[PDB]
Design a protein around this ligand. Structure first.
Ligand SMILES: CN(C)CCOc1ccc([C@H]2C[C@]3(C)[C@@H](O)CC[C@H]3[C@@H]3CCc4cc(O)ccc4[C@H]32)cc1
Ligand SMILES: CN(C)CCOc1ccc([C@H]2C[C@]3(C)[C@@H](O)CC[C@H]3[C@@H]3CCc4cc(O)ccc4[C@H]32)cc1
Lengths: 223, 222
């Protein structure tokens, strides 16, 4: 993991991407839940392909996915919706506007649409997107490992080492886009600050919903 | 604001720092914790508004947008302030000089641990004062910028231009400390990723926490 070049990192993440799934007023939440549950299965397979992730203990892999899974679903939704102003592309056959969200759902819908609009304005590129999604996976739960055994300290150090490599990769991508050193750290900062708003929307979504055994079952594979 | 140098931005942010307040209880009397902490936070919020008015670029926004940004960020800002002054007190939170609490007195339990871990992370990274004041201003300008008309796009543009100015300043400070370019952007990323965790704690705090606040903020701004 830590020996990969930036191009090799991008290649690995692009190759890990999960498929775009298809769906299937009163049935709308059931449709969305069924989709999200099917997407979570593929998210587990994707996470095992993010360099460094399977180097962690099963317990830590579970902790990271338990913290980040809804952020990951949301950032994937915002990415799929980016070219569709005013709409959230939950699936190619499930494209919704605000009025269809009208439960406390519309507040989240507006936040998601705003993030999609921001991605569009920044002209977010697909290689940047996969780097952001991997950052979410590794970062969101790394401050809530409630133990510091020696093993936990080693795990946290490895995660931070891999996060550093993804940053280096994001900078590399912008440098190849002909950006200025100053433009490079400015864009890096702008992208990472959007991650704070994605956390916010995940918290709100989790409230609106009101898992670790399922995660470990899917993660705890045999050979 | 956009014309300040990085040294000038740092100096302005340092000069704008609010004072450390004391908890308002009799030390010559039996030792109410939630009441004490709320009273402290309410007094700190006034000084927070004064600090915000001194963050370069903030008062150039409309009063409505100033209010929106403070309403979104205020608990995050109180939290990063708390973590920063607890940094030299492992396993404790220095809410005030006369109100230093550990885990057990915290029993808030879940957030208390989150705050302690943030403090540990800052301690481990050897966060400097000049970096802290940049991160705190970034929270002010970024937290509400996604939840706001041509004036609005102008306002958002101005906010991002200032944020870009503060990113330049963080980079300048790290370059000054002798970091390589690789180490600068790695450190920049590590600090900004901690801000996602402060957002999470603020959301939990709001959750646990529960005249509009916008009206009170408006009166304090005047
Ligand atoms: C995974 N299951 C174990 C738990 C169920 O998880 C989910 C069930 C439904 C959704 C839906 C319905 C939610 C929460 C609304 O109420 C407010 C925000 C909505 C989510 C936004 C992000 C998102 C992304 C997807 O790609 C598929 C569905 C969803 C949505 C998202 C996750
Ligand atoms: C500002 N008022 C309009 C509303 C009341 O605000 C507050 C009232 C109390 C606090 C307290 C008590 C809280 C919420 C706990 O329950 C969970 C997290 C706690 C806060 C953590 C951060 C913090 C920072 C301070 O420097 C002073 C108090 C507080 C705490 C923070 C803000």
């Amino acid at each position: 993991a830590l020996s990969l070049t930036a191009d090799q990192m991008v290649s690995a993440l692009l190759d890990a991407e999960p498929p775009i799934l298809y769906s299937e007023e009163a049935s709308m939440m059931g449709l969305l839940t069924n989709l999200a549950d099917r997407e979570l299965v593929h998210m587990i397979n994707w996470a095992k392909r993010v360099p460094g992730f399977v180097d962690l203990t099963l317990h830590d892999q579970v902790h990271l996915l338990e913290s980040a899974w809804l952020e990951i679903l949301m950032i994937g939704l915002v990415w799929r919706s980016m070219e569709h102003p005013g709409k959230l592309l939950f699936a190619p056959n499930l494209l919704l506007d605000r009025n269809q969200g009208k439960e406390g759902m519309v507040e989240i819908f507006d936040m998601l649409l705003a993030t999609s609009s921001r991605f569009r304005m920044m002209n977010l590129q697909g290689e940047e997107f996969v780097c952001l999604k991997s950052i979410i996976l590794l970062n969101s739960g790394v401050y809530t490992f409630l133990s510091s055994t020696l093993k936990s300290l080693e795990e946290k150090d490895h995660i931070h080492r891999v996060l550093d490599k993804i940053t280096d990769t994001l900078i590399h991508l912008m440098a190849k886009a002909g950006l200025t050193l100053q433009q490079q750290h400015q864009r890096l900062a702008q992208l990472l600050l959007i991650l704070s708003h994605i956390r916010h929307m995940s918290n709100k979504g989790m409230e609106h919903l009101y898992l670790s055994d399922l995660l470990l079952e899917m993660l705890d594979a045999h050979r």
